[PDB]
Design a protein around this ligand. Structure first.
Ligand SMILES: [Cl-]
Length: 358
């Protein structure tokens, strides 16, 4: 049995082209665990970029061609073999059709409002009884978790459901605002430094960021809050960070294009340093799983059970983190103690970890 498509009842909340937004749900009435997954797939930051994205990647701007069902995979699978600890959860997949990194409140950009509305609807479909809501996402979805997790928590508190413990899982959503390897002029989504892209995007989307983070940067420089290492310290909700040290999307936005052939020296240096700098941004994030691999996303992939860091698989790391937080309480000195933490590779090159996926 698959997750089932539901289109949002409030007609005013929509995808980019005005088609209604929605979510896929597979219910598990015997569980009080809920997993809400935010899909990724870039963004567009002006009319011409978005026109071009409407022609090439229409699925990411529209619900028109969404199938009625989706099989749950990886962390959204209900098979124990594929999802050893959380197979019995209530599963929600929220398609990305807002092109705005889940920040939005001609084309409509409503990503933040979509999430708000999904949560509101799920309260009437069993979520009012939950013990745990894990807000998870990959790529622009991972970044969306960072931008939305505290707002979801506040939304539930304010609606009078304070007992639902809200945590986040951000997969492939932790990027460096470093220099590119080779400067491009902001022309395309792939020819634009992430810093410039988000700065234009925010204004074009009327994007919002977490309030606490917004206050720590100059007025009008909210784009900082899209970068994990800047926003993470200001987060109230515990967030588990899953991040390949050599993320393909990070390479892409730094204008590195691999042929697979031997890499020149200037580019060897870039790669060595990316891994080093990424390791540095994570040194004070104990809920971290960061393998030395060149890849992109993991948590809804079927093979997410096969990657290991320091002898620990990702499902297990997550299950230990989640369980120990859940039982913890204000008197707890060290909540994560006895969990494997700081699961960050130190080796210096893509695939130095033998368990990387192909
Ligand atoms: Cl897969």
């Amino acid at each position: 049995e698959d997750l089932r498509l539901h289109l949002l009842l409030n007609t005013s909340v929509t995808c980019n082209d005005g088609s209604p937004a929605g979510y896929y749900l597979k219910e598990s009435r015997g569980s009080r665990r809920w997993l809400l997954f935010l899909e990724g797939g870039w963004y567009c930051f002006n009319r011409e970029n978005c026109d071009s994205r409407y022609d090439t990647m229409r699925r990411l701007m529209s619900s028109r061609d969404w199938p009625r069902t989706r099989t749950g995979t990886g962390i959204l699978s209900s098979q124990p073999e594929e999802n050893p600890y959380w197979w019995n959860a209530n599963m929600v997949f929220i398609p990305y059709c807002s092109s705005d990194v889940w920040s939005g409140a001609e084309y409509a950009f409503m990503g933040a409002l979509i999430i708000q509305e999904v949560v509101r609807e799920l309260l009437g479909r069993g979520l009012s009884g939950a013990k745990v809501l894990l807000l998870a996402g990959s790529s622009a979805g991972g970044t969306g978790v960072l931008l939305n997790v505290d707002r979801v928590a506040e939304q539930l508190e304010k609606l009078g459901y304070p007992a639902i413990q809200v945590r986040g899982l951000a997969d492939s959503g932790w990027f460096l605002d470093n220099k590119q390897y080779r400067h491009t002029d902001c022309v395309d989504t792939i020819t634009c430094a992430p810093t410039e892209a988000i700065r234009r995007g925010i204004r074009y989307w009327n994007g919002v960021v977490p309030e606490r983070c917004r206050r720590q940067f100059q007025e009008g420089e909210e784009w900082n809050c899209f970068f994990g290492y800047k926003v993470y310290p200001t987060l109230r909700s515990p967030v588990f960070v899953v991040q390949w040290l050599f993320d393909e999307a990070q390479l892409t936005v730094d204008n590195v294009h691999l042929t697979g052939q031997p890499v020149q020296e200037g580019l060897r240096l870039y790669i060595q340093n990316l891994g080093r700098e990424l390791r540095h941004t994570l040194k004070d994030v104990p809920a971290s799983f960061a393998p030395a691999c060149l890849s992109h996303e993991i948590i809804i992939r079927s093979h997410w059970t096969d990657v290991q860091v320091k002898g620990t698989s990702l499902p297990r790391a997550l299950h230990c983190w989640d369980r120990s937080l859940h039982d913890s309480h204000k008197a707890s000195k060290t909540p994560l103690k006895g969990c494997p933490v700081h699961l960050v590779d130190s080796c210096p090159w893509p695939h130095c970890n033998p368990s990387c996926p192909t």
